[PDB]
């Protein structure tokens, strides 16, 4: 058998900040650095955008109880792997490539309790291992319109 090193999401981007827009097509490389051999069920990836907010209330022996709530904006899967596929030693790099919504979307943004973002999942199955995921962020900033009704 052998193992996964490292497990990162390379972003090609339109200049050099992974800053998009709608319509606009977001693309780049899954990388994939393994020593020996690996077996792989599947090599997903998951593109999602939401408006997101944290909140904690004290109880009572007391203890603090988390909450989260989240608005989704975008949503998009894709298989890049399978659905076993075996692997050697060395980088291995699988492209991926979506679109965002000719619709307008929600702006990035970091308040303190709320916050827009948007972010690209990438997810490895393997036989008799725990599914590992790596969530990259990237920004999404709607290109002016001067055909904006009121």
Known sequence: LGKVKSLTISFDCLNNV???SSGDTVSGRVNLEVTGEIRVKSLKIHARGHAKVRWTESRNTAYTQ???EEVEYFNHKDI???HFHTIHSGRHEYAFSFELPQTPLATSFEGR???V???VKAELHRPWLLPVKLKKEFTVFEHIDINTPS
Do not use: K
């Open 80 to 82: 890049l792997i399978g």
């Open 18 to 20: 992974p800053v998009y």
């Open 117 to 119: 973002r948007y972010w």
């Open 66 to 68: 988390n909450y989260t």
């Open 113 to 115: 309790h709320g916050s």
